[PDB]
Write an enzyme that holds these catalytic residues in place. Structure first.
Site, PDB file in Angstrom:
ATOM      1  N   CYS B 108       0.885  -1.269   0.100  1.00 43.48           N
ATOM      2  CA  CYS B 108      -0.014  -0.037   0.035  1.00 43.48           C
ATOM      3  C   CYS B 108       0.993   1.439   0.028  1.00 43.48           C
ATOM      4  CB  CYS B 108      -0.897   0.123   1.217  1.00 43.48           C
ATOM      5  SG  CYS B 108      -1.952   1.413   1.240  1.00 43.48           S
ATOM      6  N   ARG B 111      -0.135   4.726   2.996  1.00 43.63           N
ATOM      7  CA  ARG B 111       0.163   4.162   4.328  1.00 43.63           C
ATOM      8  C   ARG B 111       0.766   5.478   5.107  1.00 43.63           C
ATOM      9  NH1 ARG B 111       4.074  -0.572   4.859  1.00 43.63           N
ATOM     10  NH2 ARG B 111       4.410  -0.359   2.399  1.00 43.63           N
ATOM     11  N   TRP B 280      -9.335   6.501  -0.158  1.00 42.73           N
ATOM     12  CA  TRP B 280      -9.638   7.257  -1.581  1.00 42.73           C
ATOM     13  C   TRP B 280      -8.681   6.892  -2.424  1.00 42.73           C
ATOM     14  CZ3 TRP B 280      -8.202  10.042   3.193  1.00 42.73           C
ATOM     15  CH2 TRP B 280      -6.615  10.184   3.195  1.00 42.73           C
ATOM     16  N   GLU B 285      -5.436   4.010 -10.312  1.00 43.04           N
ATOM     17  CA  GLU B 285      -6.106   2.962 -10.069  1.00 43.04           C
ATOM     18  C   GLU B 285      -7.306   2.726 -11.099  1.00 43.04           C
ATOM     19  OE1 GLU B 285      -6.165   1.545  -5.811  1.00 43.04           O
ATOM     20  OE2 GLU B 285      -5.930   3.753  -5.641  1.00 43.04           O
TER      21      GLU B 285
HETATM   22  C1  HEM Z   1      -6.375   6.578   2.122  1.00 41.76           C
HETATM   23  C2  HEM Z   1      -5.950   6.521   0.768  1.00 41.76           C
HETATM   24  C3  HEM Z   1      -5.199   5.204   0.092  1.00 41.76           C
HETATM   25  C4  HEM Z   1      -4.478   5.063  -0.949  1.00 41.76           C
HETATM   26  C5  HEM Z   1      -4.374   6.328  -2.133  1.00 41.76           C
HETATM   27  C6  HEM Z   1      -4.285   3.708  -1.393  1.00 41.76           C
HETATM   28  C7  HEM Z   1      -3.640   3.225  -2.384  1.00 41.76           C
HETATM   29  C8  HEM Z   1      -3.493   2.008  -2.549  1.00 41.76           C
HETATM   30  C9  HEM Z   1      -2.981   1.336  -4.134  1.00 41.76           C
HETATM   31  C10 HEM Z   1      -2.646   2.106  -5.225  1.00 41.76           C
HETATM   32  C11 HEM Z   1      -2.735   0.307  -3.849  1.00 41.76           C
HETATM   33  C12 HEM Z   1      -2.440  -0.826  -4.967  1.00 41.76           C
HETATM   34  C13 HEM Z   1      -3.956  -1.433  -5.357  1.00 41.76           C
HETATM   35  C14 HEM Z   1      -3.913  -2.069  -6.653  1.00 41.76           C
HETATM   36  O1  HEM Z   1      -3.231  -1.354  -7.559  1.00 41.76           O
HETATM   37  O2  HEM Z   1      -4.565  -3.033  -6.952  1.00 41.76           O
HETATM   38  C15 HEM Z   1      -3.203  -0.409  -2.502  1.00 41.76           C
HETATM   39  C16 HEM Z   1      -3.088  -1.604  -1.886  1.00 41.76           C
HETATM   40  C17 HEM Z   1      -3.552  -1.843  -0.427  1.00 41.76           C
HETATM   41  N1  HEM Z   1      -3.803  -1.258   0.468  1.00 41.76           N
HETATM   42 FE1  HEM Z   1      -3.927   0.879   0.437  1.00 41.76          FE
HETATM   43  N2  HEM Z   1      -4.513   2.923  -0.168  1.00 41.76           N
HETATM   44  C18 HEM Z   1      -5.263   3.874   0.701  1.00 41.76           C
HETATM   45  C19 HEM Z   1      -5.818   3.445   1.839  1.00 41.76           C
HETATM   46  C20 HEM Z   1      -5.873   2.121   2.411  1.00 41.76           C
HETATM   47  C21 HEM Z   1      -6.394   1.807   3.475  1.00 41.76           C
HETATM   48  C22 HEM Z   1      -7.383   2.649   4.603  1.00 41.76           C
HETATM   49  C23 HEM Z   1      -6.240   0.387   3.951  1.00 41.76           C
HETATM   50  C24 HEM Z   1      -6.702  -0.598   5.031  1.00 41.76           C
HETATM   51  C25 HEM Z   1      -7.043  -0.226   6.307  1.00 41.76           C
HETATM   52  C26 HEM Z   1      -5.321  -0.131   2.972  1.00 41.76           C
HETATM   53  C27 HEM Z   1      -4.822  -1.201   2.686  1.00 41.76           C
HETATM   54  C28 HEM Z   1      -4.262  -1.559   1.665  1.00 41.76           C
HETATM   55  C29 HEM Z   1      -3.942  -2.986   1.555  1.00 41.76           C
HETATM   56  C30 HEM Z   1      -4.071  -4.300   2.388  1.00 41.76           C
HETATM   57  C31 HEM Z   1      -3.534  -3.455  -0.006  1.00 41.76           C
HETATM   58  C32 HEM Z   1      -2.684  -4.542  -0.691  1.00 41.76           C
HETATM   59  C33 HEM Z   1      -3.503  -5.675  -0.839  1.00 41.76           C
HETATM   60  C34 HEM Z   1      -3.022  -6.856  -1.482  1.00 41.76           C
HETATM   61  O3  HEM Z   1      -2.136  -7.374  -1.137  1.00 41.76           O
HETATM   62  O4  HEM Z   1      -3.319  -7.268  -2.736  1.00 41.76           O
HETATM   63  N3  HEM Z   1      -5.167   0.989   2.041  1.00 41.76           N
HETATM   64  N4  HEM Z   1      -3.546   1.013  -1.745  1.00 41.76           N
HETATM   65  C1  LIG Z   2      -7.719  -7.297  -8.190  1.00 39.71           C
HETATM   66  N1  LIG Z   2      -6.186  -6.844  -7.772  1.00 39.71           N
HETATM   67  C2  LIG Z   2      -5.484  -7.455  -6.621  1.00 39.71           C
HETATM   68  C3  LIG Z   2      -6.245  -7.204  -5.321  1.00 39.71           C
HETATM   69  C4  LIG Z   2      -6.652  -8.161  -4.860  1.00 39.71           C
HETATM   70  C5  LIG Z   2      -7.333  -8.083  -3.523  1.00 39.71           C
HETATM   71  C6  LIG Z   2      -8.016  -8.905  -2.832  1.00 39.71           C
HETATM   72  N2  LIG Z   2      -8.282  -9.652  -2.115  1.00 39.71           N
HETATM   73  C7  LIG Z   2      -7.517  -6.900  -3.012  1.00 39.71           C
HETATM   74  C8  LIG Z   2      -6.952  -5.561  -3.921  1.00 39.71           C
HETATM   75  O1  LIG Z   2      -7.048  -4.442  -3.271  1.00 39.71           O
HETATM   76  C9  LIG Z   2      -5.850  -3.318  -3.096  1.00 39.71           C
HETATM   77  C10 LIG Z   2      -6.437  -2.199  -2.626  1.00 39.71           C
HETATM   78  C11 LIG Z   2      -6.968  -2.319  -1.253  1.00 39.71           C
HETATM   79  C12 LIG Z   2      -7.479  -1.153  -0.549  1.00 39.71           C
HETATM   80  C13 LIG Z   2      -7.433  -0.038  -1.151  1.00 39.71           C
HETATM   81  C14 LIG Z   2      -7.761   1.071  -0.466  1.00 39.71           C
HETATM   82  C15 LIG Z   2      -8.358   1.074   0.726  1.00 39.71           C
HETATM   83  C16 LIG Z   2      -7.587   2.396  -1.063  1.00 39.71           C
HETATM   84  C17 LIG Z   2      -7.362   2.601  -2.597  1.00 39.71           C
HETATM   85  N3  LIG Z   2      -6.969   3.629  -3.167  1.00 39.71           N
HETATM   86  N4  LIG Z   2      -6.830   1.272  -3.037  1.00 39.71           N
HETATM   87  C18 LIG Z   2      -6.814   0.192  -2.446  1.00 39.71           C
HETATM   88  C19 LIG Z   2      -6.450  -0.922  -3.167  1.00 39.71           C
HETATM   89  C20 LIG Z   2      -6.518  -6.031  -5.036  1.00 39.71           C
END
Ligand code: HEM
Ligand SMILES: CNCc1cc(C#N)cc(OCc2ccc3c(C)cc(N)nc3c2)c1
Ligand code: HEM
Ligand SMILES: CNCc1cc(C#N)cc(OCc2ccc3c(C)cc(N)nc3c2)c1
Ligand SMILES: CNCc1cc(C#N)cc(OCc2ccc3c(C)cc(N)nc3c2)c1
Ligand SMILES: C[C@H](O)[C@H](O)[C@H]1CNc2nc(N)[nH]c(=O)c2N1
Ligand SMILES: C[C@H](O)[C@H](O)[C@H]1CNc2nc(N)[nH]c(=O)c2N1
Ligand SMILES: [Zn+2]
Lengths: 413, 409
Positions: B108, B111, B280, B285
């Site tokens: 993420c 963070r 957000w 994305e």
């Molecule tokens: C607040 C603004 C946030 C932004 C801009 C953001 C941005 C991102 C982005 C761009 C990704 C890559 C996702 C993808 O391309 O599939 C990601 C992954 C992830 N985010 Fe964040 N996020 C935010 C908040 C959060 C929050 C609030 C949580 C949980 C409490 C969180 C937990 C995660 C987790 C667990 C992943 C990876 C999931 C995986 O392993 O596949 N994020 N985030």
């Molecule tokens: C489908 N691609 C793999 C994929 C699998 C799974 C699972 N299981 C979840 C995935 O979520 C990534 C993610 C999670 C949370 C996010 C939050 C809170 C905000 C944000 N802007 N982007 C986020 C992106 C992506």
């Protein structure tokens, strides 16, 4: 370690099964509890160390020519053995040298261009004794590889390491590169990546023109001796001035680049033998010049100027003016090389070719080590097929390896 | 040992000690790196040590390690495991655990915000109706008329595996996708299977390009039930371009609130299989992955046509050009509607700052380069040149199997 490892492509759903990883030789740096896949890098072999490294290689070679366990195989093993026993080293046969070189490239996990691996001209320079001799070999390499713009991939291999005090080295990181100069005011002229090396050249006697694209002299070390300076004949250095198909003003930036990417600071490792000077070359992927060489902050850093000429709003990052600029520059590069009929590959084409190559290798070989962090291009990643392709990284031998910069180790005579 | 990571653009070197606390596996070995594999690799006996480790770090974080209260908590949890085979988190622990799951999310880039997380405790929920109520409250709170606020809603933890709470949707808000007789796909191809499941379960599809999916909610291991989120709770942004007046005629839009609802939250050995969390959007994305993936909306061709680009050869970079414009449009539209969004330059920049903070105050920050680097303009963002160490800390969010492969009806 499991016999089968599956990789998946998340766009095509194609699953491939890797067995080749069982032939993994060295460590990656990763452990069970940490992954170091984004770390850039994570006196001589004794007799007893050398034996099994050589045997492993000789076996692999005879297995490749379908003569494994043959009288010729068994005899070669014996000959290599006696040689290591009486001289603490051995000499590769020409066939083995050529096979090893090709395979070091085939095994280069970070190289997206490997579909071409088996088409590599190998130049045996193991008879070289002096820096002048090295100069001669390198010129012939440059001329052959350049081929008036129809680039052909090639490697020149100088004598292997002996005691470590008689190394052959090319001090240049590439055969052809542009000088950088730090100005008293802190500004930089030319390629900032090359400041230290440029400085070494000046100290060694080089008279710098002090321009923006001065081709550096070769700095060549033979048999552990102090390195020597040579100017590459300009007519051997094919260059491409950069212009744009729509923007007439683009040419007025006075940019140009060299056609031949030839990396010269890496070490070729074959059956335990160490080839500390083995310059190899292919042709460019556009992004190597257009994203990294031009738009890296620590490089020519022209994103700003191009954006200005494009009359972009450069106040907010969210206008994406940088991204827009980056595209146009890469367009210019590809167009300029194509216009002058100098071989170059765009990142879409290169990445699609790599996916096909990878599939083929999984079929004929049981896998294909690949470093995703390096395979995916520095721009537009997710719109290339390698982005969604799961990869396994691991180190096979023969292989190309990093080695320390020679000025840090060299004992000045 | 101590490990160094270098930023090759600024030459800054940071030292990692935090990884020495890592207990889970990454999937790699000394011989094979699996950094690009998407998913590599209870009982009372295992439960207490996991609980202890967590309670220990919690009391450590509040400067009360080895206090009477610390010891009392450990004793209380032990007895609770003995007499009920599980245990329940204090509210404080729940909040701490959830924030730290986010903090430890190596993938993420967002963070820097980890400690601003609104935690909704939904552990008293017993029905799909209850879940729906909670989820509507979550959505309305998180949306906040466009001024997005991060939130997580935590439903009861797993007991025996036969009574799981699950949000069947992969995100709270998503557009449906429909398999067309002529082979193609109307809507969103990522969601074709889920859409069909909703249809098969009684949902009446309007069969548009942007149909908001119903919630499919499973409570206490029972069959999932359908609910329509009230539309006034679903904030959407029509996509237009600041130069290309024709862009709006593409008729594209997207939802404001990214809310992932299919992951598992683990804290102190406990498993929360329903824990929708939301933040957000980073623009890419939507603008890169959601719109320009081949297995997604795939509108590069359409936009490239309207830009009158030559699409005959790839070397014209028509795809790249179209890609930047689509992403400019996304950012512009959200900003114009005052809906919270971050561009990838700003986001990655913040992440670099966050890493520096983490190394300073925590001895490191687990980070997955493969995921942190944005899907466009990679090397012109600071994270590209930044070495990262990836490792797994707990509390964490984990993948879990889709419920329609486990559930018995
Ligand atoms: C607040 C603004 C946030 C932004 C801009 C953001 C941005 C991102 C982005 C761009 C990704 C890559 C996702 C993808 O391309 O599939 C990601 C992954 C992830 N985010 Fe964040 N996020 C935010 C908040 C959060 C929050 C609030 C949580 C949980 C409490 C969180 C937990 C995660 C987790 C667990 C992943 C990876 C999931 C995986 O392993 O596949 N994020 N985030
Ligand atoms: C489908 N691609 C793999 C994929 C699998 C799974 C699972 N299981 C979840 C995935 O979520 C990534 C993610 C999670 C949370 C996010 C939050 C809170 C905000 C944000 N802007 N982007 C986020 C992106 C992506
Ligand atoms: C024929 C056309 C070729 C193309 C298009 C190509 C492309 C590339 C690219 C884009 C990279 C990443 C470069 C970077 O970001 O610095 C790379 C790395 C590499 N290439 Fe190739 N290459 C070609 C030929 C060759 C040849 C002939 C060899 C060796 C015989 C080779 C060996 C390597 C190695 C060892 C690396 C990784 C170096 C490192 O670890 O830093 N390549 N290649
Ligand atoms: C006796 N020949 C037939 C045969 C039967 C069965 C069965 N049942 C399994 C077999 O596997 C061979 C094999 C070889 C190498 C391996 C390596 C390096 C690693 C690994 N994890 N597994 C491996 C398995 C072979
Ligand atoms: C300085 N950046 C890290 C870096 C360090 C070293 C070292 N030591 C070597 C590096 O070589 C990348 C490379 C090598 C050969 C290439 C060939 C033949 C063709 C081509 N188009 N691109 C190539 C790129 C890169
Ligand atoms: C094969 C590869 O691991 C996979 O496609 C990953 C790569 N990087 C990614 N990065 C982000 N942010 N999101 C993703 O879905 C992916 N996909
Ligand atoms: C920190 C990071 O590993 C480093 O900047 C790498 C990332 N991936 C790369 N990929 C390629 N092709 N070339 C590079 O120089 C780099 N640099
Ligand atoms: Zn790894």
């Amino acid at each position: 370690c499991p016999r089968f490892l599956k990789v998946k492509n998340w766009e095509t759903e194609v699953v491939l099964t890797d067995t080749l990883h069982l032939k993994s030789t060295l460590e990656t740096g990763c452990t069970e509890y940490i992954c170091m896949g984004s770390i850039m890098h994570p006196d001589v072999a004794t007799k007893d160390q050398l034996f099994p490294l050589a045997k492993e290689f000789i076996d692999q070679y005879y297995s490749s020519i379908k003569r494994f366990g043959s009288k010729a195989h068994m005899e070669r093993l014996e000959e290599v053995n006696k040689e290591i026993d009486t001289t603490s080293t051995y000499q590769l046969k020409d066939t083995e040298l050529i096979y090893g070189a090709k395979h070091a490239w085939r095994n280069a996990s970070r190289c997206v261009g490997r579909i071409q691996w088996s088409k590599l001209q190998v130049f045996d320079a193991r008879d070289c004794t002096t820096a002048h001799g090295m100069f001669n070999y390198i010129c012939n390499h440059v001329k052959y590889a350049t081929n008036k713009g129809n680039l052909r991939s090639a490697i020149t291999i100088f004598p292997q390491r002996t005691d470590g005090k008689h190394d052959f080295r090319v001090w240049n990181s590439q055969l052809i590169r542009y000088a950088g100069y730090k100005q008293p005011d802190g500004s930089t002229l030319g390629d900032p990546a090359n400041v230290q090396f440029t400085e070494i050249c000046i100290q060694q006697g080089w008279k710098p023109p002090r321009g923006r694209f001065d081709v550096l002299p070769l700095l060549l070390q033979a048999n552990g001796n102090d390195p020597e300076l040579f100017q590459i004949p300009p007519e051997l250095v094919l260059e491409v001035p950069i212009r744009h198909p729509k923007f007439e003003w683009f040419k007025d930036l006075g940019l140009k680049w060299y056609g031949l990417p030839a990396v010269s600071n890496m070490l070729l490792e074959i059956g335990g033998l160490e080839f500390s000077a083995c310059p190899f070359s292919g042709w460019y992927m556009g992004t190597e010049i257009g994203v990294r060489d031009y738009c890296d902050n620590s490089r020519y850093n022209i994103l700003e100027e191009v954006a200005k000429k494009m009359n972009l709003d450069m106040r907010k990052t969210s206008s994406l003016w940088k991204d827009q600029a980056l595209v146009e520059i890469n367009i210019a590069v590809l167009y300029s090389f194509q216009s002058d009929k100098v071989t170059i590959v765009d990142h879409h084409s290169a990445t699609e070719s790599f996916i096909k190559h990878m599939e083929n290798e999984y079929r004929c070989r049981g896998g294909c080590p690949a470093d995703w962090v390096w395979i995916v291009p520095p721009m537009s990643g997710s719109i290339t097929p390698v982005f969604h392709q799961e990869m396994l990284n691991y180190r096979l031998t023969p292989s190309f390896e990093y080695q320390p910069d020679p000025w840090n180790t060299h004992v000045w005579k």
